[PDB]
């Protein structure tokens, strides 16, 4: 609040304007980064109420209705594990809307495959989507169909191990 200091600071010209403009550019750049990463879909997709995906379990990654924040258990664990002229501007997207964007992406990639990323969301059964992915890596569809229960069990076990590893490693 010193007026003499500001009068002497005016002799140095537009340094303060350059610093403010650089910080403003960084601040809008953070929002642009979040917009580029998470807002890659313009349709908010939802999973069906019945979670019949041919034995595949997505409860650890789908949003929990019991939680007020509408986050997944993995996302809830991730949010729990992160702990003079200065102002902090709030982010343009709140954590709830970023969680909603991830929920839309998860619903699209579960119910529609990769079709929603290239155009309209075309529904496909998940054991057929998995078979298409198997054909993408050069493994025949029959291998997926014959061993669908084992692959679903392995996927659920791996997702649980992911949650345990995140909960057990600082």
């Amino acid at each position: 609040d010193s007026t003499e200091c500001s009068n002497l600071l005016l002799q140095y010209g537009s340094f303060c304007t350059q610093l403010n403009r650089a910080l403003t550019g960084i601040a809008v750049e953070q929002d642009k980064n979040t917009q580029e990463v998470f807002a890659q879909v313009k349709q908010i997709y939802k999973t069906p109420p019945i979670k019949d995906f041919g034995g595949f379990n997505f409860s650890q990654i789908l949003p929990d209705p019991s939680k007020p924040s509408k986050r997944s258990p993995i996302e809830d664990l991730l949010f729990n594990k992160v702990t003079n002229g200065l102002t902090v501007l709030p982010p343009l997207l709140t954590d709830e809307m970023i969680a909603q964007y991830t929920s839309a992406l998860l619903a699209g990639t579960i119910t529609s495959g990769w079709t929603f990323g290239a155009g309209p969301a075309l529904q496909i059964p998940f054991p057929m989507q998995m078979a298409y992915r198997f054909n993408g890596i050069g493994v025949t569809q029959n291998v997926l169909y014959e061993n669908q229960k084992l692959i679903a069990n392995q996927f659920n076990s791996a997702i649980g191990k992911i949650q345990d590893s995140l909960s057990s490693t600082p």
């Binding site: 041919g54 290239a118 155009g119 054991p127 569809q141 029959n142 169909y145």
Partner: protein
Amino acid sequence: FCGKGYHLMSFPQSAPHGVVFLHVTYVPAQEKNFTTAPAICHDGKAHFPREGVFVSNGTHWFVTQRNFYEPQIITTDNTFVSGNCDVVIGIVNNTVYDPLQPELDS
């Protein structure tokens, strides 16, 4: 990476201090519902599509390419056999045509 949709090709254009890419992409449109199955059960054998997907318009089963609706008769030339019908979950019963069958029939 090269536009929204399935990328076909791209064109470069010069711009002042920059480049403009015209991305020509393929977007699917006018989608239609069909009843689908993982495999076709015929003669105690499971048939799986070589490159397409089994679809049904309500009464008849066909095989079509995944990114465009072009129904074709389910034959031995566009399907492959692996195992019996007891393992695949959701296998349905339908006939599988054989192109060689009218040749020895006649």
